[PDB]
Write a protein that binds this ligand. Structure first.
Ligand SMILES: *[C@@H]1O[C@H](CO)[C@@H](O[C@@H]2O[C@H](CO)[C@@H](O[C@@H]3O[C@H](CO)[C@@H](O)[C@H](O)[C@@H]3O)[C@H](O)[C@H]2NC(C)=O)[C@H](O)[C@H]1NC(C)=O
Ligand code: NAG
Ligand code: BR
Ligand code: BR
Ligand code: BR
Length: 274
């Protein structure tokens, strides 16, 4: 009936922080409860902040009437500043011509227990990724396929970035089926910086075979400045631990690394593609 856009994943226990309605053609949009908003031919902006000790967990925008648009291939809703895992969001909606009204809902969790690990990891992390999509494997190497029906940019050779419902993804490097899911690690806003890193176990049984990396970040513009996520050197068999480096140009608000393991891997999986 409307068209629905999501940043983050709603869960039942989430508190309701804010909901409101906006006419998108109005000059100026009608401020609701002090949150500055604005309308344009091209943009709707809501400057939201919660003066309470909560983390934003999910934002949903529904627009009317329903139009023709596969939103999984675009990012028309995003936080220019703040976002998931913080108490603020400068919410940006890139509207289309026929879109004239919008309903906004914003959910949160206590800042004390600001963890999203469960809702993104789920029950079957081995076979289901953090988008709710099941890993799929090609017939030659048995390594995971590139997702086909969602937003994805490429940059430098080997760099592929995915976006769905506000959540970004990059994969280092290939998943194989006999790999097992070891643990998932999250960094929350209090541990995030322009450049930060985490240390992973890498000895014996827990030989890191594959990293599935997800994050939310601010984007100044519709096109994001993607981060440089990379091992600090090679993650070889002798390394007792492996350090993952997050070298960002735009600030991340929350990050989640799925750690897959395999004693049989040597750290390097490559196809004859060049
Ligand atoms: C319709 O409304 C949107 C939202 O307000 C306008 O987009 C805004 O445009 C200005 C100017 O292009 C952007 O300013 C930029 O700010 C950064 C802050 O660091 C600065 O580095 C840039 O050089 C630039 O000055 C602003 O960010 C941008 N806002 C969003 C949310 O994208 C748009 O211009 C309006 N359309 C008009 C006026 O025709
Ligand atoms: C592997 O160990 C070497 C020796 O200290 C180190 O220089 C390198 O950064 C390690 N690799 C990772 C990914 O931590
Ligand atoms: Br603005
Ligand atoms: Br959760
Ligand atoms: Br953790």
């Amino acid at each position: 009936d409307g068209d629905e856009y999501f940043i983050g994943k709603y869960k039942e226990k989430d508190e309701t922080l804010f909901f409101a309605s906006y006419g998108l053609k109005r000059d100026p949009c009608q401020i609701v409860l002090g949150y500055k908003c604005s309308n344009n031919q091209t943009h709707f902006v809501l400057n939201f902040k919660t003066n309470k000790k909560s983390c934003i967990s999910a934002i949903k925008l529904t627009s009317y009437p329903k139009i023709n648009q596969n939103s999984d291939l675009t990012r028309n809703l995003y936080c220019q500043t703040g976002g998931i895992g913080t108490d603020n969001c400068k919410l940006v909606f890139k509207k289309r011509k026929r879109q004239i009204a919008a309903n906004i809902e914003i959910y949160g969790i206590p800042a004390k227990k600001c963890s999203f690990k469960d809702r993104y990891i789920g029950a079957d992390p081995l076979h289901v990724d953090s988008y709710g999509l099941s890993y799929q494997f090609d017939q030659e190497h048995g390594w995971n396929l590139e997702r086909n029906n969602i937003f994805k940019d490429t940059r430098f050779s080997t760099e592929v970035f995915y976006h769905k419902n506000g959540l970004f993804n990059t994969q280092i490097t290939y998943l194989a089926e006999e790999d097992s899911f070891s643990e998932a690690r999250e960094i929350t806003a209090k541990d995030i910086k322009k450049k930060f890193s985490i240390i992973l176990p890498n000895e014996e049984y827990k030989r890191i075979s594959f990293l599935d990396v997800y994050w939310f970040q601010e984007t100044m513009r519709k096109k994001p400045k993607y981060p440089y996520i990379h091992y600090n050197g090679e993650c070889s068999n002798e390394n007792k631990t492996c350090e993952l480096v997050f070298d960002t140009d735009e600030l991340m608000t929350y990050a989640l690394v799925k750690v897959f393991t395999n004693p049989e891997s040597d750290g390097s999986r490559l196809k004859e593609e060049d």
